[PDB]
Amino acid sequence: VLSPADKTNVKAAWGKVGAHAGEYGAEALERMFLSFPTTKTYFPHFDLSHGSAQVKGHGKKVADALTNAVAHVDDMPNALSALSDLHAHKLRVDPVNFKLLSHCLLVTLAAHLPAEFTPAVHASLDKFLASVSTVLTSKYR
Amino acid sequence: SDGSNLEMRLTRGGNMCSGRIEIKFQGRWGTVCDDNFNIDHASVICRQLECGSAVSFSGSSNFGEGSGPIWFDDLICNGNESALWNCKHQGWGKHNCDHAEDAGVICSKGADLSLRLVDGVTECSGRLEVRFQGEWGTICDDGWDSYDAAVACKQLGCPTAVTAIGRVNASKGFGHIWLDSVSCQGHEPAIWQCKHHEWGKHYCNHNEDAGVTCSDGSDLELRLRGGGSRCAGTVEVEIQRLLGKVCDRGWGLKEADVVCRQLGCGSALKTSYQVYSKIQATNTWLFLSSCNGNETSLWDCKNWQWGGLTCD
Amino acid sequence: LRLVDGVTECSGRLEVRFQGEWGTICDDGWDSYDAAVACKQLGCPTAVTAIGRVNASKGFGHIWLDSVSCQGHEPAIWQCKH
Amino acid sequence: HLTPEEKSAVTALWGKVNVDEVGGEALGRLLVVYPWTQRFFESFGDLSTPDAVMGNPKVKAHGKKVLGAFSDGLAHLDNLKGTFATLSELHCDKLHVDPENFRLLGNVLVCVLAHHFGKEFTPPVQAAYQKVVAGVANALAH
Amino acid sequence: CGKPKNPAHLDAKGSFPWQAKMVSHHNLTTGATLINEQWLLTTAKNLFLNHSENATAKDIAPTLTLYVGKKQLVEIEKVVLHPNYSQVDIGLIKLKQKVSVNERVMPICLPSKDYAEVGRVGYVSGWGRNANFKFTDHLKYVMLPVADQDQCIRHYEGSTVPEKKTPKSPVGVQPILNEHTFCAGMSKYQEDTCYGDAGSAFAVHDLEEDTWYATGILSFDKSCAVAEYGVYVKVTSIQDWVQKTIAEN
Ligand code: HEM
Ligand code: HEM
Ligand SMILES: *[C@@H]1O[C@H](CO)[C@@H](O[C@@H]2O[C@H](CO)[C@@H](O[C@@H]3O[C@H](CO)[C@@H](O)[C@H](O)[C@@H]3O)[C@H](O)[C@H]2NC(C)=O)[C@H](O)[C@H]1NC(C)=O
Ligand SMILES: *[C@@H]1O[C@H](CO)[C@@H](O[C@@H]2O[C@H](CO)[C@@H](O)[C@H](O)[C@H]2NC(C)=O)[C@H](O)[C@H]1NC(C)=O
Ligand SMILES: *[C@@H]1O[C@H](CO)[C@@H](O)[C@H](O)[C@H]1NC(C)=O
Ligand SMILES: *[C@@H]1O[C@H](CO)[C@@H](O)[C@H](O)[C@H]1NC(C)=O
Ligand SMILES: [Ca+2]
Ligand SMILES: [Ca+2]
Ligand SMILES: [Ca+2]
Ligand SMILES: [Ca+2]
Numbered sequence A: 001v002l003s004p005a006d007k008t009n010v011k012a013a014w015g016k017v018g019a020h021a022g023e024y025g026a027e028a029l030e031r032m033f034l035s036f037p038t039t040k041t042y043f044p045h046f047d048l049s050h051g052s053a054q055v056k057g058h059g060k061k062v063a064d065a066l067t068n069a070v071a072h073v074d075d076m077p078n079a080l081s082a083l084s085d086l087h088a089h090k091l092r093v094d095p096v097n098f099k100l101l102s103h104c105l106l107v108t109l110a111a112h113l114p115a116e117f118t119p120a121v122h123a124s125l126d127k128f129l130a131s132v133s134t135v136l137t138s139k140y141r
Numbered sequence B: 001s002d003g004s005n006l007e008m009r010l011t012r013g014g015n016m017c018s019g020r021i022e023i024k025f026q027g028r029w030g031t032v033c034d035d036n037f038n039i040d041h042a043s044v045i046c047r048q049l050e051c052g053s054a055v056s057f058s059g060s061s062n063f064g065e066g067s068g069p070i071w072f073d074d075l076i077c078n079g080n081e082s083a084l085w086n087c088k089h090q091g092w093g094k095h096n097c098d099h100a101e102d103a104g105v106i107c108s109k110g111a112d113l114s115l116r117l118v119d120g121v122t123e124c125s126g127r128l129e130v131r132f133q134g135e136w137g138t139i140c141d142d143g144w145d146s147y148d149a150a151v152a153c154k155q156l157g158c159p160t161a162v163t164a165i166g167r168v169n170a171s172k173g174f175g176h177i178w179l180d181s182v183s184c185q186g187h188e189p190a191i192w193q194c195k196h197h198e199w200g201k202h203y204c205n206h207n208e209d210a211g212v213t214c215s216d217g218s219d220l221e222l223r224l225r226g227g228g229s230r231c232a233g234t235v236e237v238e239i240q241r242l243l244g245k246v247c248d249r250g251w252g253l254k255e256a257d258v259v260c261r262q263l264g265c266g267s268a269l270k271t272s273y274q275v276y277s278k279i280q281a282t283n284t285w286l287f288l289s290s291c292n293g294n295e296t297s298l299w300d301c302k303n304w305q306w307g308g309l310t311c312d
Numbered sequence C: 001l002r003l004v005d006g007v008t009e010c011s012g013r014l015e016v017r018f019q020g021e022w023g024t025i026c027d028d029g030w031d032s033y034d035a036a037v038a039c040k041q042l043g044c045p046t047a048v049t050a051i052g053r054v055n056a057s058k059g060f061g062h063i064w065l066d067s068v069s070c071q072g073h074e075p076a077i078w079q080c081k082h
Numbered sequence D: 001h002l003t004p005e006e007k008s009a010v011t012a013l014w015g016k017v018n019v020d021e022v023g024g025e026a027l028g029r030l031l032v033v034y035p036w037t038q039r040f041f042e043s044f045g046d047l048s049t050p051d052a053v054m055g056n057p058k059v060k061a062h063g064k065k066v067l068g069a070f071s072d073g074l075a076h077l078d079n080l081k082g083t084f085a086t087l088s089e090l091h092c093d094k095l096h097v098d099p100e101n102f103r104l105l106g107n108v109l110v111c112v113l114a115h116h117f118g119k120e121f122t123p124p125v126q127a128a129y130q131k132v133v134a135g136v137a138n139a140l141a142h
Numbered sequence E: 001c002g003k004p005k006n007p008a009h010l011d012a013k014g015s016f017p018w019q020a021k022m023v024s025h026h027n028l029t030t031g032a033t034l035i036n037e038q039w040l041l042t043t044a045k046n047l048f049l050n051h052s053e054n055a056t057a058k059d060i061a062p063t064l065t066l067y068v069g070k071k072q073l074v075e076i077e078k079v080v081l082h083p084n085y086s087q088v089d090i091g092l093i094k095l096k097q098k099v100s101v102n103e104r105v106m107p108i109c110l111p112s113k114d115y116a117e118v119g120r121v122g123y124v125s126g127w128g129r130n131a132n133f134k135f136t137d138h139l140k141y142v143m144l145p146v147a148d149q150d151q152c153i154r155h156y157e158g159s160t161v162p163e164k165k166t167p168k169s170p171v172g173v174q175p176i177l178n179e180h181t182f183c184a185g186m187s188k189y190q191e192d193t194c195y196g197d198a199g200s201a202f203a204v205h206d207l208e209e210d211t212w213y214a215t216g217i218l219s220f221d222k223s224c225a226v227a228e229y230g231v232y233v234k235v236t237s238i239q240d241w242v243q244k245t246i247a248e249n
Helices: A004-035 A037-042 A053-071 A073-079 A081-090 A095-112 A119-137 B039-048 B146-156 B253-263 C032-041 D004-014 D019-033 D035-039 D050-054 D057-075 D085-095 D099-120 D123-141 E057-063 E149-157 E236-248
Strands: B007-011 B018-025 B028-031 B104-106 B114-118 B125-132 B135-139 B162-165 B176-179 B211-215 B220-225 B234-239 B242-246 B284-287 C002-004 C013-018 C021-024 E019-023 E029-034 E039-043 E065-068 E072-074 E076-081 E090-095 E121-126 E140-147 E181-184 E201-206 E211-220 E230-234
Touching: A004 A037, A004 A053, A004 A073, A004 A095, A004 A119, A004 D123, A037 A095, A053 A073, A053 A119, A073 A081, A073 A119, A081 A119, A095 A119, A095 D099, A119 D019, A119 D050, B039 B104, B114 B146, B125 B176, B146 B162, B146 B211, B220 B253, D004 D057, D004 D123, D019 D035, D019 D050, D019 D057, D019 D099, D057 D123, D085 D123, D099 D123, E029 E211, E039 E211, E057 E076, E090 E236, E121 E211, E140 E149, E149 E181, E230 E236
Parallel strands: B135 B176, B242 B284
Antiparallel strands: B007 B018, B018 B028, B018 B104, B114 B125, B125 B135, B125 B211, B162 B211, B220 B234, B234 B242, C002 C013, C013 C021, E019 E029, E019 E065, E029 E039, E039 E090, E065 E072, E076 E090, E121 E140, E121 E201, E140 E181, E181 E230, E201 E211, E211 E230
C-alpha cells in the first residue's frame, strides 16, 4: 500500500518532473515499442516512425492521465474509471504490457533526472505506477 | 439522572483543549458520532471544559479510532447550551454509527493562534507562519490564491491594495505543515475561519511553503532591460526594492501584449530581443498563469506568484 | 435478426431483438464465420459472406451485443458465445 | 541474437562502466524496491532501511561479483547458455531463487545504467541491453 | 489426514500437493484445491469466463482444462455451483476418474474447528500473476497472517452498518464481504496475492495434531499489494453443503 511518506515522495517527484512529462511519455512509448516489438500489436493503425506526432500525442495523453492520478492519489479508482474500462474489456490489453510500460517510464525518468531519482523516490514511483497498473488492469476478464 | 454524575473528556489530542470527545456513563467510556455534528456542537463542547471559543470540529479518523460504546447520534444543538446531553436526540445508546465516525473538537484555549511573516524583503512580505499549540508551522501553497493572500494581509494589518502570493526571497521552512487547501472567500477575519483540509494528513513538502506580499501599489515597477530601447529586452520586475525576472512556464504573446501595453510600447511581436547590452543576474523570479490578454497591467493578472518556485 | 439500410434484402446493418426492441451489434470480434451464420439463419444465399454495413447510416439507441464468436457451427447467432 | 551495430554499441558503452559502483547500486535498488528478496541476503546483516543497504560493503562486493559475471557474459555473447551454466545450477539447486528475480535484477541494472549514462542511453542501445539481460535471465532460469 | 511430504515469495519444492491449476478456453489461469479423491474447490468467478452468466454449468464443464501435480492433466466430469453464488463464490468440480493419491497429488481435508483467529499464520500457494504480471512458471507460496474482520470491512466498504456503506476499494473492484468471509493482511516482506490465485486454500498447520487444514478459499485476488487485505470464504461456514454435495454424488 502507498504509505503517507510514499505519497509525499511521489508528489514531490511528479512536481519536479514538470512540463517535460509529455516528452517523457512519448519517449517511454517509443522505448517500449523498440525493446519489445510484441507490444505493437495493439497499435495497428499507428504511425510508429521516428518523430511521429501520433505517438507523441499518445504519450502526452498517458502522461496527463498519470498526472491526474497523482493529483487524486487518495481516490485513484474513480480517477481512472474510463481508462480502466477501456483497457479492460474494449482493448483487452494484457497485464504484462502494463508492467513493461511502467519500467520503460521509470528508466526514462532515470535518464533525464538522475539527481532527484534517489532510491526512496525510486521505491515511491514504483509503488505508484504499480497501483495505477493494478487499477487499470483490475477488471480484466 | 440529572447529569451531575456524567463527565466528559478530550483524548488523543495535542493538549487538554483538543482531541476526541469521550463521555463516561454507567462507568463506561464512550465516543459521540459525527452525524449532524457542526460548529454548534463544537461551541457546546468548548463551553463545558472551560476551554472557550471552539476553533474546529472533526470527524471519522482525525484523531484515531476509539473504543467502547457509542452514546449519541444525529443530535440537534443550538449555539448556546449548558452541556451536550441536554440536546434533543433519539435516545441514549441508540445509533447507526461505528467507531469510524467518532467526533473530535479543537478549542481556542489550547490553540494560541497567531499569524506572522518571516524571511522577506519588507515587514509584511515573505513566508507565512502559523502558531498552533505553541509550535510554529507553515501553509502548503496548494489552493493558495489571491483571496487567501488578501485575507492574510488584512489579518496582519498592512496595505490590502495589492496582495500577491509567493514567498519572496524566503527559504524553505522547517517543522509542521499546519494548514493546507485553504478556501477563503476573501472577507474572513483570519485565515483559520475559512474552510480547509484537516490539520493532520498533508503530503506537501517544505519546498511548497506558502507566503504573501502586501503592498500599497506604489512600489511595483516593471522594465525592459537589455537592448537598444526601453521597448525591447528581457522583462525585469522591481517589487519592493527586490529585482527579479519572469519565468516562461506559460509565456506567450497573449501576456506580452499586456506587458507591452503596460509599458506603453504598443503591441508584442517577438519573444526575443537583439543582445545589445548585458544584464546582471538575479535569484528571485515571477511566475504567471494564463493572462487573458486584455488586462491593463500585469499586476491585474490572475494569481501571479512572486517567488517560491524554480525555473530549472 | 434483421438487415436494414442496405443495397438488397441480403446486405446491410445487422439488428437483433430483445425484450421487445431492436438494437445494433459491435463490429469488434465480428469475423467471417459470424457473417456466415447470420446469412445462414436468414433465408438468403450463403455462398459468399462478407463483413461490413454497406452504405448504411449510424446506429440509434442501445447496442445489444458485442464480441461474439460463433465458429460457424451454431445454427443461430444467440447460440454462440457472447 | 544481436546485430553487428547493436554488438558494437553495447560493447562500446560497456567499456565506459565502472565495476565498483554500478553493480552495488543496482543490487541495493533491488533490495529496497522488492523487500521479499532480503531473505536470501540475510547473511549480509542489517537490510532494514534504504541507507543501510546503500551503506553496506557486502552489497558492493556482491555487486562487483555479479557485474564481473555480466562482463563475462558480454564477452561470451554467442555462447551465453554455456557461459552461465554453473551459475544456473547454483541458483537452481542451493538457493531456490525464482526465474523472475533474475529479470528483476536485469531491469534494475538497466535502470542504474540509465541513471549513470544520462542522455547517452539512446533507445537503440537500450534495446540491445534489454536483449542481453533477457538472454542472461533465460540462461540462468533452469 | 494432512501429511505433506515437506512442510516447507518462495518457490515450492515439494510442499503443496492440494494445489491445482486451471485454464479457461481463452487462456486465463486460476487456482483450485483438492478436497478428496474426486472433488475440488474453486471460486465461482473462475467459471463465468468469456461468456455470459446466463449459461448452464453443463456449458461450463467441458471448456476448462485442469492440471494437478507436475503438469498432470485431468478431465472434468461435472461442475456444481453454490445456490447463493451471488454472495458466496464457492464452486465444486468433479473429476472424470478418482485420482491415484501420491506425493504429488493429495487432498487437503477440512476444518473441524474455526482457525480464523486474528494473528494466526497460514500458507497460500498459487499459480497467479507475479511482479511483472506474467503467470508464474513455478509454483509460488506465501505466508499470511489472519486479519481483523472489522478493519477489512472498513477498508473495502467504509462502515460496518449496511445503511452507511459506500465503495472504497483501492483497486476498483469490490469483494463480496459478509458473515461467510474473513480477511488476511500482507506478509512481513510486503508479499500479497494478485490475479489468478483465486480458489487457493488458506492452509493452517495445527501442531497438536500435526495436520494441515484448509481454512479458506481465496475469493478476492485483485489486491496485488495495492489493497491491504485479501478476502477468503470460510470453509467452516461451507462444510455442510460440501458434505451434502459429496454424499449426493
Ligand atoms: C500507465 C499505463 C497507461 C496509461 C496511464 C494509459 C492511458 C491511456 C489514455 C489516456 C488513452 C487515451 C484514451 C482516449 O483518448 O480516449 C489510452 C488509450 C490507449 N492505450 Fe493506454 N494507458 C496505459 C497503458 C497502456 C498499455 C500498456 C497499452 C498497450 C500495450 C496501451 C494501449 C492503448 C491503446 C491501444 C489505446 C487506444 C489509442 C487509440 O485508440 O487511439 N495503454 N491509454
Ligand atoms: C541475474 C543475474 C545474476 C548473476 C549474474 C548472479 C551471479 C552470482 C555469482 C557470480 C555469485 C557467486 C558469489 C560468490 O561465490 O561469493 C552469486 C551468488 C549469490 N546470488 Fe546471484 N546472480 C544473479 C541473480 C541473483 C538474484 C536475482 C538473486 C536474489 C534475488 C541472487 C542471490 C544470490 C545469493 C544469495 C548469492 C550468495 C551470496 C552469499 O551467500 O554470499 N542472485 N550470484
Ligand atoms: C445506402 O444504400 C442503399 C442502397 O441503394 C439505399 O437504399 C435505397 O435508397 C433510395 C433512396 O436514395 C431508395 O430509392 C427510392 O426507391 C423507391 C422504390 O419504390 C421509390 O419510391 C423512390 O422514389 C426512390 O427512388 C431505394 O429504394 C433504396 N433501395 C434500393 C434497393 O435502391 C440506402 O438509402 C442508402 N442509405 C442507407 C442509410 O442505407
Ligand atoms: C532577503 O531577505 C533578507 C532578510 O534578512 C533581506 O535583508 C533584509 O532587508 C530588509 C529591508 O532593508 C531589512 O529590514 C532586514 O533587516 C534585512 N536583513 C538583513 C540585512 O539581514 C535581503 O535584502 C534579501 N536578500 C536577497 C538577496 O534577496
Ligand atoms: C477582458 O476580457 C475578458 C474575456 O472576454 C472579459 O471577460 C473581461 O471583462 C475583459 N476586461 C475588461 C476590463 O474589459
Ligand atoms: C441461500 O440463501 C437463502 C436466503 O433466504 C437461504 O434460505 C438458503 O438456505 C441459502 N442456501 C444455502 C445453500 O446456504
Ligand atoms: Ca456520518
Ligand atoms: Ca445517525
Ligand atoms: Ca504545489
Ligand atoms: Ca484558496
